[PDB]
Amino acid sequence: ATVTDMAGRTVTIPAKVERILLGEGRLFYAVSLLEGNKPLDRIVGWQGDFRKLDPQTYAIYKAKFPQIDQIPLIGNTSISPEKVLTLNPDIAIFGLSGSELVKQLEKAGVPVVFVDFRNSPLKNTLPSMRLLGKALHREQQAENYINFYQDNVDKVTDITNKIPEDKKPSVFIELRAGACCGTAGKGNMGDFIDQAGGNNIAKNLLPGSLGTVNLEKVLAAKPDIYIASGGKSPGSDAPGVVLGAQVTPEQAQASLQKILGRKGINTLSAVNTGHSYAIWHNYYNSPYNVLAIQSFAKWFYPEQFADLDPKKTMDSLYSQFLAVEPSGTYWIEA
Ligand SMILES: [Cl-]
Ligand code: NA
């Protein structure tokens, strides 16, 4: 009847939950692990980020669940309402930031539950999933995913927790690489570099999980490994790495060569020797991020993780927890 969410708030959990509001649409990723073969049946409204900013994954779901388009889009605009109480929701899910709708929902006695996959994903990913298991009456499903997640993160931290600091390769990840050089320090994808045995150039070169750092000159740190994140669609014309549910290995590869073609970056040692990589950006706010930890690791220590196939982890994730087929490309090499 009560949970403590990742904001420390105490929240009563109604006995019946069938109408879920998503205050950030891409919280569908977390919900989708709990919902089995009926991923949309309980979403009565979401903020539009998932439909508009991950159109590739959305389209995969549309092809199988056409009713996805009628799920109302919460916003002020394109958006379909912004007075959610008329959806009579049982519960609402938000991510921690790093607001007004939340206070209004409290007044009406709607339980608002805060999760977090973005600020401190190492600390918060599994507590957020167990929290959602409790608040949405999917405890066994949450625990199932937690064991799958823990077992697949163990496959990595079993090896990289015993690696000396001098052997750790230096790593710079460029977030949203196309706008230079925004990154993550103590947190967000920094956690994934930490878990995967790497040394993040910006690990304390900024006091926070997300931020932007000085341009590519500070990449005279000669990182052993280069990593760019993006989730643009093919033919987008808008600059950025091209990854997602509808991207081919070749289409991903052509976008990475071009991002590695920019000035300065094409002088880095990791670029001209084949140590450059691209990762799906939505791993930065999603409990699927285990796939990015495993991808980082296999890149950082190839010989030591040569038995570890992240595509096989992903196939097993979809097989066990999701209603759609794995498609597209979410990481790529150079
Ligand atoms: Cl974003
Ligand atoms: Na999905």
XYZ file of N, CA and C in Angstrom, residues 125-263:
417
model
N 18.883 2.281 -11.334
C 18.145 1.548 -12.362
C 17.324 0.404 -11.762
N 17.940 -0.422 -10.939
C 17.241 -1.560 -10.350
C 16.265 -1.113 -9.273
N 16.612 -0.184 -8.377
C 15.567 0.340 -7.479
C 14.376 0.951 -8.216
N 14.594 1.602 -9.369
C 13.462 2.143 -10.115
C 12.583 1.027 -10.663
N 13.181 -0.066 -11.142
C 12.367 -1.136 -11.716
C 11.583 -1.870 -10.642
N 12.209 -2.104 -9.477
C 11.487 -2.729 -8.376
C 10.389 -1.804 -7.879
N 10.682 -0.511 -7.825
C 9.665 0.451 -7.448
C 8.470 0.395 -8.404
N 8.727 0.330 -9.721
C 7.633 0.234 -10.684
C 6.924 -1.105 -10.579
N 7.674 -2.173 -10.299
C 7.028 -3.443 -10.027
C 5.997 -3.328 -8.921
N 6.354 -2.642 -7.832
C 5.426 -2.488 -6.716
C 4.256 -1.576 -7.082
N 4.532 -0.430 -7.720
C 3.483 0.565 -7.928
C 2.503 0.170 -9.025
N 2.859 -0.795 -9.875
C 2.047 -1.201 -11.017
C 1.622 -2.660 -10.935
N 1.857 -3.310 -9.791
C 1.476 -4.702 -9.565
C 2.065 -5.599 -10.638
N 3.378 -5.481 -10.819
C 4.144 -6.347 -11.711
C 5.433 -6.765 -10.996
N 5.291 -7.147 -9.719
C 6.446 -7.463 -8.879
C 7.272 -8.600 -9.471
N 6.619 -9.705 -9.806
C 7.367 -10.830 -10.344
C 8.075 -10.450 -11.637
N 7.419 -9.652 -12.489
C 8.054 -9.224 -13.738
C 9.251 -8.330 -13.460
N 9.107 -7.393 -12.516
C 10.224 -6.554 -12.104
C 11.379 -7.399 -11.597
N 11.085 -8.354 -10.715
C 12.166 -9.170 -10.183
C 12.789 -10.003 -11.283
N 11.993 -10.443 -12.255
C 12.572 -11.219 -13.337
C 13.575 -10.370 -14.113
N 13.199 -9.127 -14.426
C 14.098 -8.268 -15.190
C 15.340 -7.930 -14.390
N 15.181 -7.769 -13.075
C 16.300 -7.403 -12.216
C 17.361 -8.491 -12.236
N 16.928 -9.761 -12.160
C 17.860 -10.879 -12.246
C 18.510 -10.942 -13.620
N 17.720 -10.755 -14.679
C 18.316 -10.697 -16.003
C 19.320 -9.553 -16.096
N 18.956 -8.381 -15.585
C 19.848 -7.228 -15.654
C 21.095 -7.455 -14.807
N 20.911 -7.869 -13.550
C 22.045 -8.079 -12.650
C 22.993 -9.136 -13.204
N 22.444 -10.253 -13.679
C 23.293 -11.304 -14.229
C 24.091 -10.804 -15.429
N 23.501 -9.933 -16.250
C 24.233 -9.456 -17.416
C 25.168 -8.294 -17.102
N 24.912 -7.554 -16.031
C 25.901 -6.592 -15.594
C 27.026 -7.298 -14.849
N 26.711 -8.356 -14.093
C 27.761 -9.125 -13.429
C 28.776 -9.652 -14.437
N 28.307 -10.182 -15.574
C 29.215 -10.668 -16.616
C 30.306 -9.667 -16.944
N 30.083 -8.398 -16.637
C 31.037 -7.344 -16.921
C 31.787 -6.934 -15.669
N 31.068 -6.566 -14.612
C 31.775 -6.097 -13.429
C 32.531 -7.211 -12.712
N 32.285 -8.478 -13.060
C 33.122 -9.556 -12.549
C 34.547 -9.423 -13.073
N 34.694 -9.026 -14.335
C 36.009 -8.876 -14.947
C 36.590 -7.483 -14.710
N 35.801 -6.419 -14.876
C 36.362 -5.075 -14.810
C 36.537 -4.545 -13.388
N 35.967 -5.187 -12.376
C 36.233 -4.713 -11.024
C 37.619 -5.094 -10.535
N 38.300 -5.996 -11.237
C 39.605 -6.489 -10.839
C 40.710 -5.937 -11.728
N 40.429 -4.881 -12.474
C 41.355 -4.334 -13.462
C 42.052 -3.126 -12.851
N 43.387 -3.058 -12.892
C 44.098 -1.929 -12.278
C 43.802 -0.622 -12.997
N 44.004 0.481 -12.274
C 43.711 1.794 -12.845
C 44.593 2.100 -14.053
N 45.825 1.581 -14.065
C 46.742 1.869 -15.163
C 46.346 1.139 -16.441
N 45.678 -0.012 -16.325
C 45.222 -0.712 -17.519
C 43.922 -0.126 -18.074
N 43.191 0.660 -17.297
C 41.918 1.182 -17.776
C 42.139 2.112 -18.970
N 41.519 1.843 -20.125
C 41.626 2.775 -21.251
C 40.886 4.066 -20.968
N 41.452 5.150 -21.470
C 40.806 6.451 -21.415
C 39.683 6.497 -22.445
N 38.575 7.139 -22.078
C 37.346 7.111 -22.869
C 36.746 8.500 -22.885
N 36.344 8.958 -24.065
C 35.478 10.118 -24.172
C 34.267 9.704 -24.983
N 33.094 9.910 -24.406
C 31.832 9.724 -25.098
C 31.285 11.105 -25.442
N 30.884 11.309 -26.723
C 30.251 12.557 -27.165
C 28.728 12.374 -27.247
N 27.993 12.956 -26.288
C 26.540 12.788 -26.241
C 25.880 13.649 -27.309
N 24.884 13.081 -27.996
C 24.091 13.840 -28.964
C 25.010 14.479 -30.008
N 26.023 13.707 -30.417
C 27.176 14.193 -31.161
C 26.763 14.806 -32.492
N 26.353 16.075 -32.465
C 25.909 16.789 -33.645
C 24.987 17.937 -33.285
N 25.565 19.099 -33.000
C 24.814 20.285 -32.592
C 25.632 21.548 -32.837
N 31.035 21.909 -30.236
C 31.191 20.483 -29.966
C 31.324 20.122 -28.513
N 30.991 18.855 -28.272
C 31.515 18.072 -27.166
C 30.727 18.290 -25.887
N 29.506 17.761 -25.841
C 28.741 17.664 -24.611
C 28.895 16.246 -24.087
N 28.859 16.058 -22.768
C 29.242 14.746 -22.232
C 28.468 14.469 -20.953
N 28.938 13.480 -20.190
C 28.438 13.115 -18.874
C 29.639 12.943 -17.955
N 29.598 13.546 -16.765
C 30.661 13.297 -15.815
C 30.341 12.239 -14.786
N 30.124 12.639 -13.539
C 29.871 11.687 -12.460
C 28.402 11.265 -12.554
N 28.141 10.294 -13.440
C 26.784 9.826 -13.696
C 26.397 9.751 -15.152
N 25.108 9.510 -15.399
C 24.562 9.197 -16.731
C 25.466 8.158 -17.396
N 25.880 8.345 -18.661
C 26.704 7.328 -19.309
C 28.114 7.260 -18.721
N 28.490 8.210 -17.871
C 29.714 8.040 -17.100
C 29.684 6.787 -16.242
N 28.548 6.525 -15.584
C 28.408 5.280 -14.832
C 28.722 4.071 -15.690
N 28.269 4.083 -16.950
C 28.460 2.923 -17.821
C 29.932 2.743 -18.167
N 30.633 3.848 -18.426
C 32.083 3.790 -18.605
C 32.748 3.265 -17.336
N 32.326 3.759 -16.161
C 32.905 3.279 -14.899
C 32.702 1.787 -14.735
N 31.459 1.320 -14.925
C 31.170 -0.101 -14.746
C 31.945 -0.942 -15.743
N 32.118 -0.432 -16.961
C 32.717 -1.219 -18.030
C 34.233 -1.205 -17.983
N 34.818 -0.579 -16.971
C 36.252 -0.646 -16.767
C 37.032 0.462 -17.426
N 36.369 1.534 -17.832
C 37.076 2.612 -18.476
C 37.255 3.831 -17.605
N 38.119 4.725 -18.063
C 38.416 5.969 -17.378
C 37.836 7.117 -18.191
N 36.759 7.707 -17.680
C 36.037 8.758 -18.372
C 36.779 10.075 -18.212
N 37.197 10.632 -19.347
C 37.955 11.880 -19.385
C 37.301 12.948 -18.515
N 35.975 13.055 -18.571
C 35.251 14.098 -17.857
C 34.736 13.644 -16.498
N 35.218 12.497 -15.990
C 34.621 11.882 -14.802
C 34.438 12.883 -13.665
N 35.337 13.859 -13.548
C 35.168 14.934 -12.579
C 35.552 16.274 -13.186
N 35.698 16.324 -14.506
C 35.927 17.568 -15.222
C 34.665 18.402 -15.331
N 33.645 18.050 -14.569
C 32.409 18.797 -14.405
C 31.728 18.214 -13.176
N 31.086 19.034 -12.364
C 30.430 18.520 -11.154
C 28.955 18.199 -11.387
N 28.705 17.070 -12.041
C 27.334 16.684 -12.314
C 27.268 15.490 -13.235
N 26.045 14.969 -13.375
C 25.847 13.807 -14.233
C 25.911 14.200 -15.703
N 25.242 15.289 -16.081
C 25.242 15.780 -17.450
C 25.776 17.206 -17.502
N 26.483 17.514 -18.575
C 26.952 18.869 -18.788
C 27.692 18.927 -20.103
N 28.124 20.132 -20.451
C 28.962 20.325 -21.626
C 30.337 20.800 -21.198
N 31.352 20.333 -21.911
C 32.731 20.666 -21.608
C 33.322 21.398 -22.805
N 34.462 22.053 -22.552
C 35.244 22.711 -23.588
C 35.431 21.784 -24.780
N 35.603 22.402 -25.952
C 35.610 21.720 -27.239
C 36.750 20.716 -27.372
N 36.985 20.258 -28.601
C 37.788 19.067 -28.834
C 39.258 19.230 -28.460
N 39.732 20.450 -28.180
C 41.135 20.611 -27.805
C 41.451 19.847 -26.522
N 40.557 19.909 -25.531
C 40.716 19.122 -24.316
C 40.718 17.622 -24.595
N 40.339 17.209 -25.805
C 40.647 15.871 -26.293
C 42.063 15.771 -26.882
N 43.014 16.575 -26.373
C 44.432 16.219 -26.377
C 44.762 15.243 -25.260
N 43.742 14.793 -24.525
C 43.909 13.702 -23.579
C 44.102 12.362 -24.276
N 44.113 12.347 -25.607
C 44.439 11.164 -26.397
C 43.676 9.923 -25.937
N 42.339 9.964 -25.899
C 41.591 8.831 -25.348
C 41.856 7.558 -26.147
N 42.058 6.450 -25.432
C 42.268 5.187 -26.137
C 41.041 4.781 -26.943
N 39.839 5.123 -26.458
C 38.567 4.737 -27.065
C 37.713 5.982 -27.307
N 37.087 6.042 -28.486
C 36.141 7.093 -28.845
C 34.737 6.513 -28.989
N 33.742 7.274 -28.518
C 32.357 6.808 -28.438
C 31.417 7.981 -28.656
N 30.562 7.900 -29.677
C 29.571 8.932 -29.963
C 28.164 8.367 -29.791
N 27.257 9.184 -29.272
C 25.892 8.741 -29.061
C 24.945 9.540 -29.942
N 23.915 8.866 -30.426
C 22.877 9.527 -31.187
C 21.767 8.550 -31.478
N 20.617 9.096 -31.846
C 19.525 8.248 -32.270
C 18.715 8.805 -33.427
N 19.360 9.549 -34.333
C 18.691 10.092 -35.514
C 18.210 8.982 -36.457
N 17.187 9.321 -37.276
C 16.597 8.436 -38.279
C 17.340 8.539 -39.606
N 17.277 7.501 -40.439
C 17.914 7.581 -41.763
C 17.380 8.739 -42.600
N 18.261 9.287 -43.439
C 17.865 10.354 -44.347
C 17.434 11.616 -43.641
N 17.788 11.749 -42.369
C 17.274 12.801 -41.505
C 17.703 14.204 -41.900
N 18.830 14.341 -42.602
C 19.440 15.623 -42.927
C 19.905 16.354 -41.668
N 19.149 16.245 -40.573
C 19.604 16.802 -39.298
C 20.832 16.040 -38.803
N 21.887 16.730 -38.376
C 23.152 16.043 -38.111
C 23.105 15.264 -36.809
N 23.866 14.191 -36.784
C 23.882 13.305 -35.640
C 24.148 11.892 -36.093
N 24.511 11.059 -35.128
C 24.671 9.645 -35.411
C 23.306 9.041 -35.702
N 23.297 8.012 -36.544
C 22.077 7.382 -37.029
C 22.017 5.981 -36.437
N 21.144 5.797 -35.455
C 20.944 4.505 -34.811
C 19.474 4.393 -34.438
N 19.007 3.156 -34.283
C 17.683 2.911 -33.769
C 17.055 1.692 -34.413
N 15.780 1.488 -34.082
C 15.072 0.272 -34.470
C 14.989 0.088 -35.973
N 15.149 1.161 -36.766
C 14.978 1.084 -38.222
C 16.263 1.380 -38.994
N 17.424 1.322 -38.334
C 18.717 1.602 -38.957
C 19.411 0.286 -39.273
N 20.058 0.216 -40.454
C 20.825 -0.959 -40.851
C 22.273 -0.814 -40.408
N 23.002 -1.927 -40.287
C 24.436 -1.813 -39.994
C 25.154 -0.871 -40.945
N 24.857 -0.951 -42.244
C 25.488 -0.061 -43.211
C 25.066 1.393 -43.003
N 23.784 1.633 -42.722
C 23.340 3.007 -42.503
C 23.956 3.579 -41.234
N 24.048 2.760 -40.183
C 24.754 3.198 -38.986
C 26.218 3.454 -39.298
N 26.840 2.550 -40.065
C 28.266 2.673 -40.348
C 28.564 3.938 -41.149
N 27.705 4.270 -42.118
C 27.922 5.462 -42.931
C 27.801 6.739 -42.110
N 26.942 6.736 -41.097
C 26.818 7.912 -40.246
C 28.000 8.037 -39.289
N 28.606 6.914 -38.894
C 29.707 6.988 -37.936
C 30.979 7.456 -38.620
N 31.273 6.909 -39.807
C 32.393 7.414 -40.599
C 32.304 8.916 -40.800
N 31.094 9.428 -41.019
C 30.925 10.852 -41.257
C 31.095 11.643 -39.972
N 30.635 11.101 -38.838
C 30.887 11.801 -37.578
C 32.377 11.732 -37.233
N 33.038 10.626 -37.571
C 34.480 10.506 -37.402
C 35.269 11.284 -38.450
N 34.589 11.882 -39.429
C 35.238 12.655 -40.464
C 35.403 14.113 -40.089
N 34.660 14.593 -39.084
C 34.770 15.991 -38.677
C 36.207 16.322 -38.294
N 36.573 17.593 -38.471
C 37.910 18.059 -38.130
C 38.228 17.775 -36.662
